[PDB]
Structure 1
Amino acid sequence: DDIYKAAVEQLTEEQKNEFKAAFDIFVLGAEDGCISTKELGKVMRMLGQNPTPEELQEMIDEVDEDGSGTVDFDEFLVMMVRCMKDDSKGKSEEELSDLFRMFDKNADGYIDLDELKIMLQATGETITEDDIEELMKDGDKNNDGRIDYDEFLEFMKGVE
C-alpha cells in the first residue's frame, strides 16, 4: 500500500544513510535479493531497535505482504514508520493548531465531517464517504463524528 512511498517521504535522510550503512551487512555471501524471513528477527535486532520474537514473527506475517520473504526500501521505510512513527516530523501540535483553525473554517475547535469534507475539497481530493470517515475515525478518537484538535494532533502528528 501507499504508506510505503509515504514513509519514503515521511522518513528523514540522516536515518536512511545509516539505514543503508547497516543494510550492507545482511548478505551472507553472494546474495542479490534472496533475503529470508527467519532473519527478520535478527535484522530488526540490528538497526537499533529492541524487538521481541513475538513481534518478529508477526512482522514476518505483518510484513512480507508480497510473501516472497522480500521487502522493498519502500516496505523497509514503511514498516519502520508503521510501527516506529519516523514519519514526516509531524510538523508540530501548534503549527498544527494554526492549520486546524483553517480546518475549522467555522472556528470549531473540531474537524467535523463537514470541515473534513470542505478541506479535502480544498485539496481538490473528492469526498468518498469512507475518505472523510476514514479520516474522521482515524482522527475522531472520541468517535464524536468529528475530529477535535488533539484528536487532530494524534491524528496528524507524524503527518506532512
Structure 2
Amino acid sequence: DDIYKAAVEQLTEEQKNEFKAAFDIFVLGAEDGCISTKELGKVMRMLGQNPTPEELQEMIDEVDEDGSGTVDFDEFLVMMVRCMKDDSKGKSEEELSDLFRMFDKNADGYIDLDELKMMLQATGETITEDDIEELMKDGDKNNDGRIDYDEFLEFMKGVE
C-alpha cells in the first residue's frame, strides 16, 4: 500500500506508463481512455482461475468516490493503496480519542465550528469554503454545529 507508493515516490507518473504497457501486453485497445479496469482483471482471470467479477467491481469502484465522477491518477493511487490496506484507520483509534480530547479543550463532548476551524488553522490547510462545508458535513453528519466522538471518527474515517 503505502510501501509501494513510497518506494515509487521519487519517481513520476511513468509507473502508470509501465502499467499501460503491461495492459497493452494483455488488454491493448482501450476505447474510453477513461476508468475501465474490469476488462484487464477479467482477462487475467480467463487464464484458468475461478471467475469473480466482484473483485473487478470493487477495484473499479474504489477510484470514483468524490462524486464529481472523475478518476484521476491520484485516484488510481488511492484505489491501489486501498484495495489492500495495511497501515490504515489512522493506526490506533486511541490516538484518535486523544486527538479528539485535544480538540475538545472545553471538555464539552461536542466539537463545534470553532474547534474544527482552529484545528484547521493550526494545520493551516487551505481548503475552499465549499470544501470547508463539505468536510464539516463529513464530520457534522446531522449538520447541527456539534461533533461528538462518533462524528469525528466518521470525518477521520479512513484518514491516516
TM-score normalised by L of structure 1: 0.54
The change in CA–CA distance for 1:10 and 1:123 in structure 2 (over 3 A counts) is farther
The change in CA–CA distance for 1:67 and 1:99 in structure 2 (over 3 A counts) is closer
Instruction: State the Cα deviation string for residues 96-141 of structure 1 (Å, max 9, x = none).
Output: 0100111223223222211111111111235743343222211122
Q: Give the number of the structure whose alpha-carbon radius of gyration is greater.
A: 2
Does structure 2 conserve the Cα–Cα contact (< 8 Å) formed by 1:140 and 1:146?
A: yes
Residue 10 of structure 1 pairs with residue 15 of structure 2 = no
Does structure 1 conserve the Cα–Cα contact (< 8 Å) formed by 2:140 and 2:146?
A: yes
The change in CA–CA distance for 1:50 and 1:111 in structure 2 (over 3 A counts) is farther
Partners in 2 of 1:155 and 1:50 — Cα distance? 38
Give the equivalent residue in structure 2 for 1:91.
91
Does structure 1 conserve the Cα–Cα contact (< 8 Å) formed by 2:103 and 2:111?
A: yes
Q: How many residues align?
A: 160
Which stretch of the first structure deviates more once superposed, 123-132 or 144-153? 123-132
Which stretch of the first structure deviates more once superposed, 148-157 or 37-46? 37-46
In angstroms, what is the RMSD of aligned CA positions? 7.5
Q: Which runs of 5+ in 1 are unaligned?
A: none
The change in CA–CA distance for 1:15 and 1:153 in structure 2 (over 3 A counts) is farther
Instruction: State the Cα deviation string for residues 50-108 of structure 1 (Å, max 9, x = none).
Output: 99768957976995999999987643332346787777442222210100111223223
Which stretch of the first structure deviates more once superposed, 135-144 or 27-36? 27-36
TM-score normalised by L of structure 2: 0.54
Task: Name the % identity.
Answer: 99
Structure with bigger RCO (C-alpha 8 Å, 6+ apart): 1
Q: Which runs of 5+ in 2 are unaligned?
A: none
Which stretch of the first structure deviates more once superposed, 11-20 or 82-91? 11-20
Q: Note the C-alpha offset of 1:145.
A: 2.2
SS in 1 for 2:111: strand
The change in CA–CA distance for 1:108 and 1:52 in structure 2 (over 3 A counts) is farther
The change in CA–CA distance for 1:61 and 1:136 in structure 2 (over 3 A counts) is closer
